[PDB]
Amino acid sequence: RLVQLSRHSIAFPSPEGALREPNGLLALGGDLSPARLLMAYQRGIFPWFSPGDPILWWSPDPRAVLWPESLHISRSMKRFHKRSPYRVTMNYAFGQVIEGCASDREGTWITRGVVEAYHRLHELGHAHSIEVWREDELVGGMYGVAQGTLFCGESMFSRMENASKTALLVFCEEFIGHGGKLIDCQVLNDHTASLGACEIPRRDYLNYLNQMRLGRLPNNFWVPRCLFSP
């Protein structure tokens, strides 16, 4: 019940036809071109594969998700952020952020081809990054693909205590304050779960997707700017 993607066509098979185990395995092949990738997110699909393997496309059931408002924040994190040593920006250094993610340990799945593919979406205005700075040094951040009022988180990275939590916390506030509705996490992991991510039915997620992709945030919401300083 899988499928080999057409090298000339950008079409995808329906997500409900994906495998149960591995969860969401939907197709393989094709390419990571701007249009293809973009099409995959509109349909609740995303590429995920290790170096050496051919492109693998997924749409898991259930789906990992994070309600911005339901973001969990311990009391020591609140004390920390009130006196934060960090500065947070948006779309200041997409290239550095994704490279920071691809440099962790699964950062090994963020292959050169993947870095190049998402960089294209960034240049084209679809992928965005949140940077966390400690003085002059980039110490964390995250990036994803905007889909209207729905944001699909791709990865995060941390080089200093609470750096990635500061990226998400600040991002959520900004996002919530301007109409953001949901953050897609694809698959629930340990870190993502401690932040408040939960699981909902694949069709529920696809319903939200179709509804939120039409939604709109302020026209200049993603222009590069400082989001948190003093």
């Binding site: 995303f46 995920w48 990992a64 993610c101 699964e106 950062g107 799945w109 963020i110 995250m142 994803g144 988180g153 791709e154 990865s155 995060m156 996490c185 694809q186 698959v187 992991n189 340990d190 870190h191 993502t192």
Partner: peptide, 5 residues
């Protein structure tokens, strides 16, 4: 964020 597990 899938690239965290």
């Amino acid at each position: 964020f899938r690239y965290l597990g």
